[PDB]
Structure 1
Amino acid sequence: KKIFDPQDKFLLYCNKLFVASCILSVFVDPFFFYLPVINAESKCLGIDRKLAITASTLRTFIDVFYLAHMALQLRTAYIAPSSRVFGRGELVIDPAQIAKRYLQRWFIIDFLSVLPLPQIVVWRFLQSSNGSDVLATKQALLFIVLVQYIPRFLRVLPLTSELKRTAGVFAETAWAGAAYYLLLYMLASHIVGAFWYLLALERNDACWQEACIDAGNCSTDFLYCGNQNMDGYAVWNRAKESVLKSKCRADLDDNNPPFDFGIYTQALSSGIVSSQNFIVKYCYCLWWGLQNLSTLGQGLETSTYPMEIIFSISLAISGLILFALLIGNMQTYLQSLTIRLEEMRVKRRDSEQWMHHRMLPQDLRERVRRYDQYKWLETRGVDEEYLVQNLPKDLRRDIKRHLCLALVRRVPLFKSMDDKLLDAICMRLKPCLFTESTYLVREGDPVDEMLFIIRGRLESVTTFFNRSLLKEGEFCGEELLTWALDPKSGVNLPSSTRTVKALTEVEAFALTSEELKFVASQF
């Protein structure tokens, strides 16, 4: 039967063009809300038919593509806890109980999403020559899509809210944290503008259904398209555009209109509910969605109709959530971006506080500031030895042999020595930094590190006193070496013979005394 193993590469693209199907499926459900239109020629309420076949086709052509996922997790192994395994889990390709492994928790949420519930509402309407069913199609689309939002957004939640916590294919920039919470706005605006469109047509249907009864010579079947060849429609036809105009007109300047449309008067006064261009209607509703989600309903002037008020409350709450999520994921990105700079500024404020508290002389305060600025310019806050010590030992040894082998193999006692032990010497070379006019050593002081110069120029006088220069590649500290390999010394740090002043800003690699005894005790 070939029950699949869970880390197959075939179940890596069938979960790559699969979560894309779960993403594109919650964009198609709002397009069923643009199905009711108003035919302004006939003043009847109708259904867009080549948007009905379009949304039914594009939702079915995703859901039977989805039907090749519970027919494949049907063939699925899993991992179970055991101490027999040697490898963190058993794989069970036995088909007798993996069926229950799939169909005990994560089948019902995934089965209540491929159900063609908004496709059978469209079905018995478009297969008729009778206009009586415009009511039922508009009746059975708000709440079915509203309740199937929950299984369709719960089958994208583990693949988004935990693929943002531990992301898989992204590290480096802002193309999945800002460009995800900004397309979460564009999705929610797409859903909210479609609710606004559909509820705007329901309020216009309510107005027309109540203004037709007050006229008396009208049945509410006459307000729907396809009911023109009915008896009594001819006496209603000559009184349509006075009854529906004196009672159900929508203007944005009326403060006491005959019917209050509230937040839906912008939809009926602009005429997008009777728009023949779908680009105009979709763009106008999507922008209403984004404008009222972005501004938390601020500018909504609702009527005293409780479903409309509750729809406005939902917009305010959803916009508050969406805004808090966006600025919280942008602050989390920006704070992690400038973390070393803010650490440098905290460390810099601490040093000013400590030097003011201790009242250091200003020549000693300039030397502290100079070293801190130089260390920030070179390292940028990065602890290099902590980065190196967290690498594998082979990668450590290769990186350290790239950085420090030519420096150690210019010492004459180290170049002719070995390869075994100098590759243990250039694992303790740590980087030192020296600002200008820093005395690296002065005479009489114990030499406690050998320095192999990377960058910058130095100086050396001993006892106008036969000066000696030092530059990029040379070393300094050979008094420590001969002392350390000689066993006739003990722990006796030898005195310095030279005064070594940093002529420029210097980088070096330092080999301290106790790290030199360990490589001298390998004989």
Structure 2
Amino acid sequence: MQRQFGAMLQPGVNKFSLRMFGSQKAVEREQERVKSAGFWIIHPYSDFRFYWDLTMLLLMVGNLIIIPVGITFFKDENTTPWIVFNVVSDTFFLIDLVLNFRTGIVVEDNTDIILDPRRIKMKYLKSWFVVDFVSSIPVDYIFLIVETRIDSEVYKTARALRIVRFTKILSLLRLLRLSRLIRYIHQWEEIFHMTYDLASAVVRIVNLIGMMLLLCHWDGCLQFLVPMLQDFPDDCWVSLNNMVNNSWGKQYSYALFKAMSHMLCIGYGRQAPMGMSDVWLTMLSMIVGATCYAMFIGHATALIQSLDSSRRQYQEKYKQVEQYMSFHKLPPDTRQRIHDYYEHRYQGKMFDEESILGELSEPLREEIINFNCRKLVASMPLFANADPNFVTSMLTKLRFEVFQPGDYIIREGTIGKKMYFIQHGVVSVLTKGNKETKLADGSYFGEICLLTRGRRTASVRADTYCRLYSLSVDNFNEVLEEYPMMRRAFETVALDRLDRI
């Protein structure tokens, strides 16, 4: 077959493809650019390249841990399970090197992804090739075959000891697969959606901890490699501590201890570096370790300063309220009422509701405000018998207000400018020469003055912690010009009060 593997090479339809391209037709035009780019070409957003590069991450983390251990702590390991492990690993890192000449390269300077196989070839050779070519081919296994052709007797003389010390240096060229480890994680963590939705301070602090553990692991093997290459001199940490003929569990464990002590800021065990090699390795690990630890405090600080923001923003605003009250020296009763205001108005979290609504689409501002005001719509007798466009056009105009008990919301004998809807609590309409009356959750007041452009006719005073909704004059005249049929309903209720008045 030739069809079913072409579906893996071209970017399929999911959420990511849509996000990258817009409509589904833009993906369908992209899926035809893959097939028209030549035979057997890989698109980088496709499902093959995502699940190929996932298996290479599970192979590099295998070979960046097992390789620097099996070179040092085993003084001769050329058994069958080890060489097969290196040949199988060298197979995938050649196939990965082959498939990089067929993968499209994302250019951050144009809107196109290059799928011409020659332009892919000329960009890969210039930027990351030799680091991915040295780490691909088995360099150590070539050199033993080449030195076999150079000299047949290179296994008997005193040169043979130098070659084996030269061989383990060449097999550390396979640690250049960190360059493919780093690139295939930055490309993975953006595409993978659960890491794309995490905060960037959480993502970078995981990449650091994965790097601090890996550098401490390589350093732990390097504290044992450099004395081992020097045939364990009589001043090296390994000799004095008498760790030449222990198991490879302890050697590595003690070496990891020394590296972690040098890095994490602790002091080594009274073995003041006494040999030049040891002094310069410890000074290497002290500088490397204290730099990675100071970058760990930098990420941990940036993570903490973006944990709990709204509350921070509520308290930073209220601290400016507190210092404003002491600058003008308010009485402590008015300081108590203003502190009773913010925890009843804002309830501990301060959002900027105007911008959060305004960035959204209209069809979503109509949906949120129709959800936030369901306790007002279902309780009022006005809104259950109205046009649903009228209800949505009303609720977008309102603004939320809080009045403490004892406050005069409307003073009689002023010019009216707002209309009030009662969400919570009861108020007291105080009438000149008549009995006071209460209004409940769902009654509305402040409409007589807006229909006549006159002055206020009665006092309104809060009794509970009333949470009201305000409607200005300019919005009230604008809504009725759209819907003149709902104008007469307010004229009916305003006829009733002026009757009672």
The bucket for the TM-score relative to the shorter chain is 0.7 to 0.9
* 2:76 corresponding residue in structure 1: 47
Once the two structures are TM-superposed, the CA of residue 120 in structure 1 deviates from its matched residue by: 5.5
* 1:368 corresponding residue in structure 2: 338
Moved more, 357-366 or 173-182: 173-182
Kept in 1: contact 2:449–2:456 (CA 8 A): no
Give the one of 361, 373, 387 matched to 2:356: 387
Give the one of 476, 483, 486 matched to 1:516: 476
Kept in 2: contact 1:177–1:333 (CA 8 A): no
Give the one of 185, 192, 195 matched to 2:212: 185
* 2:461 corresponding residue in structure 1: 500
Kept in 2: contact 1:432–1:507 (CA 8 A): yes
**What does 1:441-456 correspond to in 2, within 5 Å?**
441-454=410-423, 456=424
Q: What is the CA deviation profile of residues 353-388 of structure 1, one whole-angstrom value per residue up to 9, with x for unaligned ones?
A: 21111122222222222223334535x132233222
Kept in 2: contact 1:303–1:309 (CA 8 A): yes
Separation in structure 2 between the aligned mates of residue 500 and residue 395 of structure 1, nearest angstrom: 36
Q: 1:134 to 1:404 in 2, by over 3 A?
A: farther
**What does 1:477-488 correspond to in 2, within 5 Å?**
477=445, 479-480=446-447, 484=450, 486=451
Kept in 2: contact 1:178–1:329 (CA 8 A): yes
Moved more, 322-331 or 387-396: 387-396
Once the two structures are TM-superposed, the CA of residue 332 in structure 1 deviates from its matched residue by: 0.7
Give the one of 353, 363, 371 matched to 1:402: 371
Once the two structures are TM-superposed, the CA of residue 30 in structure 1 deviates from its matched residue by: 1.9
Q: 1:24 to 1:423 in 2, by over 3 A?
A: farther
Secondary structure at the counterpart of residue 163 of structure 2: helix
* 1:318 corresponding residue in structure 2: 288
Once the two structures are TM-superposed, the CA of residue 190 in structure 1 deviates from its matched residue by: 0.6
Q: What is the CA deviation profile of residues 169-218 of structure 1, one whole-angstrom value per residue up to 9, with x for unaligned ones?
A: 33458964554433332212111110011123234x153xxxxxxxxxxx
Q: 1:11 to 1:192 in 2, by over 3 A?
A: same
The one-letter amino acid paired with 1:190 is: H
Q: What is the CA deviation profile of residues 273-293 of structure 1, one whole-angstrom value per residue up to 9, with x for unaligned ones?
A: 4223x4333333323322221
> What's the % identity of the aligned pairs?
20
1:155 has 2:193 as partner: no
Separation in structure 2 between the aligned mates of residue 431 and residue 68 of structure 1, nearest angstrom: 64
Separation in structure 2 between the aligned mates of residue 180 and residue 502 of structure 1, nearest angstrom: 58
The one-letter amino acid paired with 1:497 is: A
* 2:167 corresponding residue in structure 1: 140
Give the one of 22, 27, 45 matched to 1:7: 45
Once the two structures are TM-superposed, the CA of residue 299 in structure 1 deviates from its matched residue by: 5.9
Give the one of 71, 74, 81 matched to 2:101: 74
1:462 has 2:430 as partner: yes
Once the two structures are TM-superposed, the CA of residue 334 in structure 1 deviates from its matched residue by: 0.7
Separation in structure 1 between the aligned mates of residue 222 and residue 235 of structure 2, nearest angstrom: 18
Kept in 1: contact 2:422–2:443 (CA 8 A): yes
Separation in structure 1 between the aligned mates of residue 67 and residue 271 of structure 2, nearest angstrom: 27
Once the two structures are TM-superposed, the CA of residue 439 in structure 1 deviates from its matched residue by: 4.5
Kept in 2: contact 1:34–1:197 (CA 8 A): yes
Secondary structure at the counterpart of residue 310 of structure 1: helix
The one-letter amino acid paired with 1:391 is: L
RMSD: 3.9
Higher relative contact order (CA 8 A, sep 6+): 1
The one-letter amino acid paired with 2:138 is: P
The one-letter amino acid paired with 1:327 is: I
Separation in structure 1 between the aligned mates of residue 164 and residue 477 of structure 2, nearest angstrom: 88
Q: What is the CA deviation profile of residues 231-283 of structure 1, one whole-angstrom value per residue up to 9, with x for unaligned ones?
A: xxxxxxxxxxxxxxxxxxxxxxxxxxxx422xx2xx3455544223x433333
Aligned residues: 434
Q: What is the CA deviation profile of residues 96-124 of structure 1, one whole-angstrom value per residue up to 9, with x for unaligned ones?
A: 43322333323233223223235557999
Once the two structures are TM-superposed, the CA of residue 323 in structure 1 deviates from its matched residue by: 0.8
Separation in structure 1 between the aligned mates of residue 87 and residue 403 of structure 2, nearest angstrom: 70
Once the two structures are TM-superposed, the CA of residue 7 in structure 1 deviates from its matched residue by: 2.2
Kept in 2: contact 1:67–1:114 (CA 8 A): yes
Kept in 2: contact 1:28–1:59 (CA 8 A): no
* 2:13 corresponding residue in structure 1: none
**What does 1:20-419 correspond to in 2, within 5 Å?**
20-36=58-74, 46-49=75-78, 53-54=81-82, 57-78=84-105, 89-118=111-140, 133=160, 135-142=162-169, 145=172, 149=175, 151-159=176-184, 169-170=194-195, 171=197, 176=203, 178-203=205-230, 205=231, 207=233, 259-261=234-236, 264=237, 267-276=238-247, 278-295=248-265, 301-303=271-273, 305-378=275-348, 380-405=349-374, 407-408=376-377, 410-419=379-388
Separation in structure 2 between the aligned mates of residue 475 and residue 63 of structure 1, nearest angstrom: 79
* 1:216 corresponding residue in structure 2: none
Once the two structures are TM-superposed, the CA of residue 415 in structure 1 deviates from its matched residue by: 4.0
Separation in structure 1 between the aligned mates of residue 244 and residue 341 of structure 2, nearest angstrom: 70
Q: 1:410 to 1:142 in 2, by over 3 A?
A: same
Kept in 2: contact 1:296–1:319 (CA 8 A): no
Once the two structures are TM-superposed, the CA of residue 335 in structure 1 deviates from its matched residue by: 0.4
Q: 1:390 to 1:24 in 2, by over 3 A?
A: farther
Once the two structures are TM-superposed, the CA of residue 316 in structure 1 deviates from its matched residue by: 1.1
Q: 1:333 to 1:384 in 2, by over 3 A?
A: same
Q: 1:271 to 1:79 in 2, by over 3 A?
A: closer
Separation in structure 1 between the aligned mates of residue 145 and residue 259 of structure 2, nearest angstrom: 29
Kept in 1: contact 2:73–2:251 (CA 8 A): no
Kept in 1: contact 2:407–2:462 (CA 8 A): yes
* 1:248 corresponding residue in structure 2: none
Separation in structure 1 between the aligned mates of residue 341 and residue 191 of structure 2, nearest angstrom: 38
Q: What is the CA deviation profile of residues 210-232 of structure 1, one whole-angstrom value per residue up to 9, with x for unaligned ones?
A: xxxxxxxxxxxxxxxxxxxxxxx
Kept in 2: contact 1:408–1:452 (CA 8 A): no
Q: 1:448 to 1:70 in 2, by over 3 A?
A: farther
TM-score normalised over the length of structure 1:
0.70
Q: 1:73 to 1:517 in 2, by over 3 A?
A: farther
Separation in structure 2 between the aligned mates of residue 521 and residue 417 of structure 1, nearest angstrom: 16
Which structure 2 residue ranges, 5 or more long, are not aligned? 1-38, 148-153, 484-501
Secondary structure at the counterpart of residue 427 of structure 2: strand
The one-letter amino acid paired with 1:184 is: M
